[PDB]
Amino acid sequence: VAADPDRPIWFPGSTPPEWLDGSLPGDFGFDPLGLSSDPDSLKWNVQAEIVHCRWAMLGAAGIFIPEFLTKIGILNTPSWYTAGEQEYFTDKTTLFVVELILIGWAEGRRWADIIKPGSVNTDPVFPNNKLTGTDVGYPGGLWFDPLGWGSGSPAKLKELRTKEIKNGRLAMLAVMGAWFQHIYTGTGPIDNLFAHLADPGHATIFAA
Amino acid sequence: DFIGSSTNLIMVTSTTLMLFAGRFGLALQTGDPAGFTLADTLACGTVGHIIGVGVVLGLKNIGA
Amino acid sequence: MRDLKTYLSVAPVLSTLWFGSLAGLLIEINRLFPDALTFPFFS
Amino acid sequence: EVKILVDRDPIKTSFEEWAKPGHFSRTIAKGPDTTTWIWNLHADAHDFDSHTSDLEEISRKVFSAHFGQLSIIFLWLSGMYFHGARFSNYEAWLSDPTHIGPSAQVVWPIVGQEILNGDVGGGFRGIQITSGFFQIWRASGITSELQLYCTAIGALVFAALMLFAGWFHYHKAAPKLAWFQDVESMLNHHLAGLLGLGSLSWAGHQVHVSLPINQFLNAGVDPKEIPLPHEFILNRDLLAQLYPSFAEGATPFFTLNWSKYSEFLTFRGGLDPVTGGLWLTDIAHHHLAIAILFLIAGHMYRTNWGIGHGIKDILEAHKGPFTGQGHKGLYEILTTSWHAQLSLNLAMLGSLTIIVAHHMYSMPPYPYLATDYATQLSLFTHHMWIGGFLIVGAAAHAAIFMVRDYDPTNRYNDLLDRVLRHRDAIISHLNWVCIFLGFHSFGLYIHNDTMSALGRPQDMFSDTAIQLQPVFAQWIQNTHALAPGVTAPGETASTSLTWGGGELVAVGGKVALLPIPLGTADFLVHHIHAFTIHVTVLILLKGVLFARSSRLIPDKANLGFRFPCDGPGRGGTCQVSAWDHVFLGLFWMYNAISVVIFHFSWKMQSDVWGSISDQGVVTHITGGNFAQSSITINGWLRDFLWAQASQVIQSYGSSLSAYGLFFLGAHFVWAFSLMFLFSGRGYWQELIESIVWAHNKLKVAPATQPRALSIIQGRAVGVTHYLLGGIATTWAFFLARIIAVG
Amino acid sequence: RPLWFASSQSLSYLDGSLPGDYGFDPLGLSDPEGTGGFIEPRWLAYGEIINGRFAMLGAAGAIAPEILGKAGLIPAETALPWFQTGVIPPAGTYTYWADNYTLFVLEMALMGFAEHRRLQDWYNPGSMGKQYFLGLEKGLAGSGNPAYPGGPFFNPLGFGKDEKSLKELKLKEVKNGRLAMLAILGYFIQGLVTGVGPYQNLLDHLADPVNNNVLTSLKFH
Numbered sequence A: 001v002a003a004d005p006d007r008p009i010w011f012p013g014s015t016p017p018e019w020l021d022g023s024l025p026g027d028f029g030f031d032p033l034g035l036s037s038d039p040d041s042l043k044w045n046v047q048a049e050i051v052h053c054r055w056a057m058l059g060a061a062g063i064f065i066p067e068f069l070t071k072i073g074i075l076n077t078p079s080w081y082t083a084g085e086q087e088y089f090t091d092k093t094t095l096f097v098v099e100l101i102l103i104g105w106a107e108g109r110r111w112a113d114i115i116k117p118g119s120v121n122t123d124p125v126f127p128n129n130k131l132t133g134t135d136v137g138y139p140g141g142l143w144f145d146p147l148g149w150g151s152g153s154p155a156k157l158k159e160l161r162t163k164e165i166k167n168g169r170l171a172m173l174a175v176m177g178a179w180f181q182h183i184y185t186g187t188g189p190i191d192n193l194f195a196h197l198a199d200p201g202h203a204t205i206f207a208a
Numbered sequence B: 001d002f003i004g005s006s007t008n009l010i011m012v013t014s015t016t017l018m019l020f021a022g023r024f025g026l027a028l029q030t031g032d033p034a035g036f037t038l039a040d041t042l043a044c045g046t047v048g049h050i051i052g053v054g055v056v057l058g059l060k061n062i063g064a
Numbered sequence C: 001m002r003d004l005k006t007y008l009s010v011a012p013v014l015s016t017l018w019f020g021s022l023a024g025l026l027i028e029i030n031r032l033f034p035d036a037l038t039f040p041f042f043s
Numbered sequence D: 001e002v003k004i005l006v007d008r009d010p011i012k013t014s015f016e017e018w019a020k021p022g023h024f025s026r027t028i029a030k031g032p033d034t035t036t037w038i039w040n041l042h043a044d045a046h047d048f049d050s051h052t053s054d055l056e057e058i059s060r061k062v063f064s065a066h067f068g069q070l071s072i073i074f075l076w077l078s079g080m081y082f083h084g085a086r087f088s089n090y091e092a093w094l095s096d097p098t099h100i101g102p103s104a105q106v107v108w109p110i111v112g113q114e115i116l117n118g119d120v121g122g123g124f125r126g127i128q129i130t131s132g133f134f135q136i137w138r139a140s141g142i143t144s145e146l147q148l149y150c151t152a153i154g155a156l157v158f159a160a161l162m163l164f165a166g167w168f169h170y171h172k173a174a175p176k177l178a179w180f181q182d183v184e185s186m187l188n189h190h191l192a193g194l195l196g197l198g199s200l201s202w203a204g205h206q207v208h209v210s211l212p213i214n215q216f217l218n219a220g221v222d223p224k225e226i227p228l229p230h231e232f233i234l235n236r237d238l239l240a241q242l243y244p245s246f247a248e249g250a251t252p253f254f255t256l257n258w259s260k261y262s263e264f265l266t267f268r269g270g271l272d273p274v275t276g277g278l279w280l281t282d283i284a285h286h287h288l289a290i291a292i293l294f295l296i297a298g299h300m301y302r303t304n305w306g307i308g309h310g311i312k313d314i315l316e317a318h319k320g321p322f323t324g325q326g327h328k329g330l331y332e333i334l335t336t337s338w339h340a341q342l343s344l345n346l347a348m349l350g351s352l353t354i355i356v357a358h359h360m361y362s363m364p365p366y367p368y369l370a371t372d373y374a375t376q377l378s379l380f381t382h383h384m385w386i387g388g389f390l391i392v393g394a395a396a397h398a399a400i401f402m403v404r405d406y407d408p409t410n411r412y413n414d415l416l417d418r419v420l421r422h423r424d425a426i427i428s429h430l431n432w433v434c435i436f437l438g439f440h441s442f443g444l445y446i447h448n449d450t451m452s453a454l455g456r457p458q459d460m461f462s463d464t465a466i467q468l469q470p471v472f473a474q475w476i477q478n479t480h481a482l483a484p485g486v487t488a489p490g491e492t493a494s495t496s497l498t499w500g501g502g503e504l505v506a507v508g509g510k511v512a513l514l515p516i517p518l519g520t521a522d523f524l525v526h527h528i529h530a531f532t533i534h535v536t537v538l539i540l541l542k543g544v545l546f547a548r549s550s551r552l553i554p555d556k557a558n559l560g561f562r563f564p565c566d567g568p569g570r571g572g573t574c575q576v577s578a579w580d581h582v583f584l585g586l587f588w589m590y591n592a593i594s595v596v597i598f599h600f601s602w603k604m605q606s607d608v609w610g611s612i613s614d615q616g617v618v619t620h621i622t623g624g625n626f627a628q629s630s631i632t633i634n635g636w637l638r639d640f641l642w643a644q645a646s647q648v649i650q651s652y653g654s655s656l657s658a659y660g661l662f663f664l665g666a667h668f669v670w671a672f673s674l675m676f677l678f679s680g681r682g683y684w685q686e687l688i689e690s691i692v693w694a695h696n697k698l699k700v701a702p703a704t705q706p707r708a709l710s711i712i713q714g715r716a717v718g719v720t721h722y723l724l725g726g727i728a729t730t731w732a733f734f735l736a737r738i739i740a741v742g
Numbered sequence E: 001r002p003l004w005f006a007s008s009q010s011l012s013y014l015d016g017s018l019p020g021d022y023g024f025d026p027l028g029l030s031d032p033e034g035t036g037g038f039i040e041p042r043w044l045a046y047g048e049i050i051n052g053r054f055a056m057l058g059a060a061g062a063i064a065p066e067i068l069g070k071a072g073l074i075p076a077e078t079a080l081p082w083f084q085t086g087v088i089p090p091a092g093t094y095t096y097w098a099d100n101y102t103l104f105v106l107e108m109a110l111m112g113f114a115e116h117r118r119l120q121d122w123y124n125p126g127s128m129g130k131q132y133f134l135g136l137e138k139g140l141a142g143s144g145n146p147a148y149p150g151g152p153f154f155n156p157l158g159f160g161k162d163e164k165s166l167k168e169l170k171l172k173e174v175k176n177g178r179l180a181m182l183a184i185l186g187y188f189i190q191g192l193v194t195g196v197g198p199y200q201n202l203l204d205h206l207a208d209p210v211n212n213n214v215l216t217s218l219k220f221h
C-alpha cells in the first residue's frame, strides 16, 4: 500500500484527489464525485469494486464462453439473457432460496471480515483450518489461494491486484454491454461481434 | 432598390438630412474635425432610415 | 462525503426518503392487496 | 463605462454547508435550542438582505436563484410537453377539438382513483386539463407527439443549463456589483434582445410554422396528412401554394413593398370563425411589430458609447414646481436596493398578469380556447390570482425597502419624502373612498336584497327598477364596436367581439364570445371591484407608508418589517407592522379576486357562453340570470353558489370526483386556517408545555424544545391556509361546474 | 502601433503584447478587470488563434472539393460543397465508408484525446510530458505558451529561431485565421441564402457581377 505521487492517472494533467494516495492496487485517481472521500467509505468501496469485479468476470465468462463455444465451437447453450426462463431439476424460486442461503453464508463472513478486519479466519467446524489473509478482500486460504500466488512482495502483490481489478472493470463493462446489446439488439453478444466485424460501419448501435 | 425612383430619392435625402444634422450641430473615435464617430453616423443613418421608411411607405398610403 | 450524508440524514431529507419508501410500500400493498376491509387470515 | 466585472471562485462548491443547516444567519448557525429555529431556517432562507450587508453577494445570490427558478420552469415545461407527448390525447384532440376533452394526465389504477381517468374523448381515459397547452400546440403547429417529446427533452436540457448557470454565476465566476448596477445595458438587452428578438423569433415561427400548418388544420386536413414544418423551410413551393408572397422572398421586405405580404401579415382584426381564436395572420404581424418596437426601445439607454439616455439624466431632468427636487435620487435607491426593484416589477408583472387574464377571454388568441370554457375560465381565474398575489408582494417589498434599504441621509429621494409627509392625507382619503365605495356598491346589493325580501322589486337597483347603467362603459363599448371605420380603417372588423355592435362567432355547437351587454349588475359589481381594490390598496399602502413610523410607534423601523407587535400598550398595537398589513391585504385581495372571478364565471355563463343551435338560437349555460340575480346577494348564494355547486357535489362516483374532494378539503383547510388567525400563541405554548410534561413523564422530552408558533408565523399559517382553502374551493367549484355542463 | 477602430477603454490593456493586435475591442471582452470564466484576455486570444486555425482548415476543406473538384482532379461524387457532404443530411448525405454517426464518434474520441490534452496543457502547462502517453509525450510539452507549443510534433522544422520572425509569423497566422473565420461565416450565410456551394457562388459572381451579388440575391434559395 505504498503511495505513488506520479502514477499515471485516468485524466492526465488533472490533480488526483487527496484520498487516493496511489496506495491501492489500481488507483488512477478516478473519483470526481468524491464517493470515497471518507476513509471507511473508501475501504468499503474497495471491496465493493473487488466483488463486483469478480462476479462480473465470472459473469462475462459464463456469458461469452457459452456464446463463443456455441456459435463456432459448436455446443448447445440456450442463451445468457433467457437462461432464467429455462427449466432445470429444481423450481425457480427454490434454488434461488438455496443459493441465497449458501451465498449469504459467505457474504456474512465477508461482512464480518470488513467490519472486523481479522475475525473469520478459523473454520468453525475444523479450527485447525485457516485463511492466511491479512489484507481485507484477499483471503489467502486453501480454498481461495491453494497455489500460493496471493503472497509475496507487496509490490508484486499490488501489480497483481491491479491486474485483477483491471480485468474486472472491463468485465463489468462487458457484462452491462451484453445487457444493453441484448436489449437494443435482438441477437446475442458474439453474434453482435460477428455482425460488427462483417461491416463495422452499418452494424453499430445506430439504426437510423 | 431601383435607384432614381421616388422611394429611393426620398430615402437618400432623409438619410443625408439626418447625417447632416448629426455632423453639424449633433441631432469610433476622433476621425473627423467635428467628433463624428462611426456610432454617431450609424445612429444618424438609422434614424434617417426610420423617418425615410415612415414618410415613404406613407406617401404611398395617401398621395404618391 | 461525510457532510453530504450528514445532510441526507437531516430531518426533511430523511423524512421524505422514509415516507417515499413507506408510501411505495403501502402503495404496492394496496395494488397487490387492494380493496381490503377485513383481515381474513385466521378469521 | 459598462463592463463585465466578474470575479472567479468566490465560493466553494461543497456539501459542508448543507450539513450545517442555518449557516446563512448568525443566530441560526449555532443550533436548534427551540423548534422555532427550523421555522426561522425557512423564513430567513431567501432573506439575503439580512444574511449579508453588502449588495454584491445579495445580487449574486438572487441571480443564481433566478437561474434556479428558470431551471424549475424549464423542468415544468418539460413535464407539460412530455405528458402531452406520452400521456395525452393531443394527437386525437386535433381531429375533433370541439368535442374531445383535452387531457394530458393519467392516474395509476391502485385504490379506485382510476375513475379519474374518464371519458375525455379521443379513445383516451384521463383527466380533462384546463391549462390550454393543447390550444397553444395547435397554435404552434405541432400536429404530433414526437415534437412534444423533443420539446420536453430540449426543455430538460435548458433546465440543466440554467442549473449549471446558477452554479457558475455563484460559485465559479460570480458577477460583482458593478455588473448588476449597469441597468442601462440590462434594459437595452431585455427590451432589445429578450423581448424584441424573442417576439421576432416567435413571429418567424408564426409565419413559417404555425400559419401554414393552421391553414391546413383549419381546412379540414388531418394532422397525419399535413407536411412537416421544416418542409416549408426546405421546400418553399408548398409554403407558397397558400401564401404566394413567399415566392418573392424578402424582396417585398427590403424594397418596402410590404403591401404584397398581407396574405400572412394581416390586420383583419377579430376571431377566426372556423376555430374561435384570433387570426394567426394578425398575431404574426403583431409579434413582428412588437419586435420592431422593442428593438428601437432597447437602444435608448447609454451603455458605453456617446449615445443613449443616462437614466440619471432622465430622472434628474424632471423636477416639479411645488413637487420639489422631483425624481432625483431614484436611480440610487433602485440600483442600490433589490427590494425596491422587486416591488416595482412585482406590481407591474401582477397587473400585467391581470391584463393578460382580461385580454385572453375577450380576444381569444389560441384556436379552440373560447370553446374550451374550462380552459378560458381557469386561465382568467389563474392569472387574476397571480396578479393579486404579485401586487400584494409588491406591497410587502415596498415595505421592506422602507424599513431596510430606505436611507434619507445617503440614498435620499424627494418625492418619497413628500409622500411620507402627507401620508395621513393619502390614507385618510383612501379610508374615506373605501367606505364610500363599500356603501355605494355593497349597500346597493343590500338594498336590492331588502327590497326583494319586502316584496318591493320596483325599488331595487336593477335593469328593471332603478337604472344604474354603465353609461361611460356603454359609450366605450359602442364606440369600440363602431371603431372599424373612420377611426380605425383597414381593420375589416372590431379588435374584439365583446362589444354590443359585434357579432357571434359560432364554433361548432358553442358560441365563443358574442357581445357582452353591460347593465346595472355590471355597474354594481364593477364598483364592488373598485371597492375591493381600493381597500386592498388602503391596507397595503398604509403598511408601506407607516412601515417606519406612526403616531403610535415612531420607531417602528427599529422593530423591523416583520414583527408582531409592540405589546398590549397603547390600547394594543398588534399588527402595526407592514408584514401584518400585507397579511390583511392578502385576505382583501382574496375577496377582490374571488368576486372578480365570480363576476367572470356568472357573466360568461349567463350572457356569453352557452350553445347555439344551427337555427341560430343561443341558449346560455345559466339562462341570462345575471342582470336579475346578481343585483342581490341572495342570487349569488342561490343562482351562482348553490346552483353551480350542483356539479361539484353531485360529482361523486364520476371523473370529476377529485374536484368535489378538494372542494370539501379546501373548505376544511380554510376553516383550519381560522384556528390560526383567531387564536394566539400563548394558549398553544401552555398546551404544549402540558403535553411536554406528559412526554417528560415518559423520557420523551425532545431537546429541540417544543414551542408554539411565533405570532407572525401563526398569522402566516392562517393566511396561507385561508387563501389555499378558499382558492382551492373556488378552483374545484369552477372546474367541475364548467367541465360538467361544458 | 496601428489602431483600427480602437476605443479608449480597449488600448489600456491591448499594449501590443498579443500577436496581431490593432486595438479593436469596442465591446471590451478582453478587459482584465475581473473577467473570470472563459471571458478573459488569455483564453480569448487562445480561442481566437484556435478558431482561426480550425477556420483555415475549414475554408481550405469546405472548398477544396470545388476549386479542384470542377478542375477534374477529384471525382464528381466526392466533390459536393460543404453543406451537401453529410454534415447536414437535411441538405444531403454522401455515403462514406461508415455511418454518418460513427464518424462523429470517431471525431469525438480522437479529438477528445487531443483536445483534453490541449486543455490540460492550458490549465497547468508543465504537464503533457510528466505522464506516459505511448512514449510520444516528450514533444507534447508545450514549452512556454498554450497557443504556441512549438514541439517536434507541432513545430518539427524551426521557424521561431528569432523572436522577430516568430512574432511576424504569428501575426500572419492570426491574420490568415481571422480571414478564414470571416470566410467560414461567408460560407454559412451564402449556403443559407443561396443553398449552393461557395465556389459556385464565386463563379456566378465572376460571370456577371451585376446581377450576382448580395443585393440581387437577397431573395433566398
Ligand code: CLA
Pocket (backbone or CB within 6 Å): A010, A020, A024, A025, A026, A027, A028, A029, A030, A031, A034, A035, A036, A037, A042, A045, A046, A047, A048, A049, A052, A169, A170, A172, A173, A176, A177
Ligand atoms: C462497481 C462499481 C465500482 C465501485 C464501487 C468502484 C469503487 C472504486 N473505484 Mg473503481 N471503477 C469501476 C467500478 C467501480 N469502482 C469501473 C467499472 C471502472 C472503469 C470504468 C473503474 C475505474 C476506476 C479507476 C480508474 C479508479 C477507480 C477507483 C475507485 C475507488 C475510488 C472511487 C470511488 O469512490 O468509487 C465509488 C464508486 C461508486 C460508488 C459507483 C458509482 C455509482 C453511480 C451510481 C454510477 C452511475 C453512473 C455510471 C457512469 C453509469 C454506469 C453505466 C455503465 C454501463 C457504463 C473506489 C475503491 C480509484 C481508486 O482508488 O482505485 C483503487 C481509481 O483510480 N475505479
Ligand code: CLA
Pocket (backbone or CB within 6 Å): C025, C026, C029, C030, C033, C034, C035, C036, C037, D110, D111, D112
Ligand atoms: C384514520 C382513518 C382511516 C382509516 C381507519 C382508514 C382505513 C382504511 N383505508 Mg382509508 N383513508 C383515510 C383514512 C382512513 N382510512 C384518509 C384520510 C384518506 C385520504 C388520504 C383515505 C383514503 C383511502 C383510499 C383511497 C383507500 C383507503 C383504504 C383503506 C383500507 C386500507 C387497508 C390496507 O391496504 O392496509 C393493509 C395494510 C398495510 C398497508 C400495512 C402493512 C404494514 C406492514 C406490512 C408491517 C406489518 C408486518 C409486521 C412485520 C408485523 C407482523 C407480525 C410479526 C412480525 C410480529 C382501510 C380500511 C383502501 C381500501 O382498500 O379501502 C377499503 C383504499 O383504496 N383509504
Ligand code: CLA
Pocket (backbone or CB within 6 Å): D430, D431, D432, D434, D435, D436, D437, D438, D439, D442, D443, D444, D446, D535, D538, D539, D584, D585, D587, D588
Ligand atoms: C362581511 C364582512 C365584513 C364587512 C361588512 C366589513 C366591513 C368593513 N371593513 Mg372589514 N374585514 C373583514 C370582513 C368585513 N369587513 C374580514 C373578514 C377581514 C379580515 C382581513 C377584514 C379586514 C379589514 C381591513 C383590514 C379593512 C377593512 C375595512 C372595512 C370597511 C370597508 C367598507 C366600509 O366601511 O364601507 C361601508 C360599510 C360597509 C360596506 C359594510 C356593510 C354595511 C351596510 C352597507 C349598511 C349597514 C347598515 C346601516 C348603517 C344601518 C345601521 C342600522 C342601525 C340599526 C345600526 C368596513 C368597516 C377597511 C377600512 O376600515 O377602511 C375603509 C380596512 O382597511 N376590513
Ligand code: CLA
Pocket (backbone or CB within 6 Å): D004, D006, D161, D162, D164, D165, D168, D169, D173, D174, D175, E035, E036, E037, E038, E039
Ligand atoms: C440570464 C442569463 C444569463 C446572463 C445574464 C449571463 C451573463 C454572463 N455570463 Mg452566463 N450563462 C448562462 C446564462 C446567462 N449568463 C447560461 C444559461 C449558461 C449555460 C449555457 C451560461 C454559461 C456561462 C459561461 C460558461 C460563462 C458565462 C459568462 C457570462 C458573462 C459574460 C457573457 C458575455 O459577455 O456574453 C458572451 C456571449 C457570447 C460570446 C455568445 C455565445 C454564443 C452562444 C453559442 C449563443 C448565445 C445565444 C443564445 C443561446 C440565444 C440563442 C438561442 C438559439 C437556440 C438560437 C456574464 C456575466 C462568462 C463569464 O465571463 O463568466 C461569468 C463565462 O465564462 N456564462
Ligand SMILES: CC1=C(C/C=C(\C)CCC[C@H](C)CCC[C@H](C)CCCC(C)C)C(=O)c2ccccc2C1=O
Pocket (backbone or CB within 6 Å): C015, D675, D676, D677, D678, D679, D680, D681, D682, D684, D685, D707, D708, D709, D710, D711, D713, D714, D715
Ligand atoms: C395551532 C396553533 C399553534 C400551534 C401549532 C403547532 C406548533 C404546529 C404543530 C406541530 C407541527 C405540525 C410540527 C410537527 C411535525 C414535525 C415536522 C415532526 C415530525 C413528526 C412526524 C409527523 C413525522 C400556534 O403556535 C399559534 C400561534 C399564534 C396564533 C395561532 C396559533 C395556532 O392556531
Ligand code: SF4
Pocket (backbone or CB within 6 Å): D564, D565, D566, D567, D568, D569, D572, D573, D574, D575, D680, D711
Ligand atoms: S395580542 Fe399578540 S400581537 Fe397583540 S400586543 Fe399582545 S402579543 Fe402583541
